[PDB]
Amino acid sequence: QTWSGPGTTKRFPETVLARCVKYTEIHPEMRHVDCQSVWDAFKGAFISKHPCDITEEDYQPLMKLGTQTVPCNKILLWSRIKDLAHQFTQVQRDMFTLEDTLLGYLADDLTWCGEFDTSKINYQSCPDWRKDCSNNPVSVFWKTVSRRFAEAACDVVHVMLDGSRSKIFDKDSTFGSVEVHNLQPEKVQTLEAWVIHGSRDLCQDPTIKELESIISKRNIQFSCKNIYRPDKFLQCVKNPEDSSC
Ligand SMILES: Nc1nc2c(=O)n3cnc2n1[C@@H]1O[C@H](COP(=O)(O)OP(=O)(O)OC[C@H]2O[C@@H]3[C@H](O)[C@@H]2O)[C@@H](O)[C@H]1O
């Protein structure tokens, strides 16, 4: 193929449009959104543009339309453990991840790119962030929304981390390279990490100490908890202290 990454997801346009409709139906705060407009702004960011030359400015019309307030003190970040984060917030909406927002919901699990000097979508391949370029439509989208999500957070912010990874905290992740550096010291009191086990006290892991030290220097308190049994954890969230939770 031209590029090394997978092509635009089959039915991408129909899918984004349908997700926008469904989202705006469910969430009253976004009932004002015109979904065709959202789609046109989304398209505008990457159609007829070189897919290794995308900027955050390309996504500004979309950011504008998807403008949204979520409770700033109930934010859940995560790294390498998306599924658990999603299952947790779905129980009773204790917290909100980026996918609980319109823009995050539209884009989750999709890939897309265009081509320079033709107005079509590329269903054959899209740039891989490593081999091709990092300035590609998908990578640039997530960097942009994740920066914005972190900037809006306040009070106690939580992050779920995968304890089974080689680096439980990875400075190379979007959490580690973007979100950590965009939490606002004026607003964020504490970052609390939940390290999910797959054992030891993983909160004393070296990369966790690194995370602690980094956020301390931004003037933010750090807290850490082991979640030894994600299965029991979810059961306790669903059945709160009904049992021995
Ligand atoms: N679908 C999706 N939602 C995402 C999200 O909300 N965030 C980042 N990436 C996201 N993705 C895609 O999922 C893959 C894999 O992401 P990883 O497991 O390595 O974790 P990370 O890099 O630390 O990003 C998570 C972090 O940033 C925000 C979010 O708020 C969260 O706090 C990304 O490349 C992206 O294409």
Numbering used by the authors: 48 to 245, 250 to 296
Task: List sentences quoted exactly from the publication behind this structure.
Cyclic ADP-ribose (cADPR) is a second messenger that mobilizes intracellular Ca2+ in various types of cells including sea urchin eggs, T-cells and pancreatic β-cells. In biological systems, cADPR is synthesized enzymatically from nicotinamide adenine 5′-dinucleotide (NAD+) by the action of ADP-ribosyl cyclases. cADPR is readily hydrolyzed at the unstable N1 link to give ADP-ribose (ADPR) in both neutral aqueous solution and under physiological conditions, thus rendering chemical synthesis of non-hydrolyzable analogues attractive. Residue Glu-146 was identified as critical in regulating the multi-functionality of CD38-mediated NAD+ hydrolysis, ADP-ribosyl cyclase and cADPR hydrolysis activities. We report X-ray crystal structures of two non-hydrolyzable inhibitors in complex with wild-type CD38, one using an 8-substituted N1-cIDPR analogue derived from structure-based design considerations and another using a different hydrolysis resistant ligand, cADP carbocyclic ribose (cADPcR).
Preformed crystals of wild-type CD38 were soaked with a solution of 8-amino N1-cIDPR. The structure was refined to a resolution of 1.87Å and contained two molecules of CD38 in the asymmetric unit with 8-amino N1-cIDPR present in the respective active sites. The 2″- and 3″-OH groups on the “northern” ribose form two hydrogen bonds with the carboxylate group of Glu-226. In addition to Glu-226, the pyrophosphate group interacts with a number of previously identified amino acids including Trp-125, Arg-127, Thr-221 and Phe-222. Importantly, the 8-amino group forms a hydrogen bond with the carboxylate group of Asp-155 as predicted by our modeling studies. The higher definition of the X-ray maps for the 8-amino N1-cIDPR/CD38 complex, in addition to the extra hydrogen bond between the amino group and the carboxylate of Asp-155, indicate a likely increase in affinity of this ligand for the protein over the parent N1-cIDPR. Indeed, 8-amino N1-cIDPR inhibited cADPR hydrolysis with an IC50 of 56 µM, over 5 times better than that obtained for N1-cIDPR. The crystal structures of N1-cIDPR and 8-amino N1-cIDPR in complex with CD38 were aligned based on their active site residues. Both structures are very similar except for the position of Glu-146. In the 8-amino N1-cIDPR complex, the side chain of Glu-146 is displaced significantly to form an H-bond with the N7 atom of the hypoxanthine ring (such movement of Glu-146 could not have been readily predicted from the non-dynamic docking protocol used in our modeling studies). The conformational change of Glu-146 probably reflects the enhanced affinity between the inhibitor and CD38.
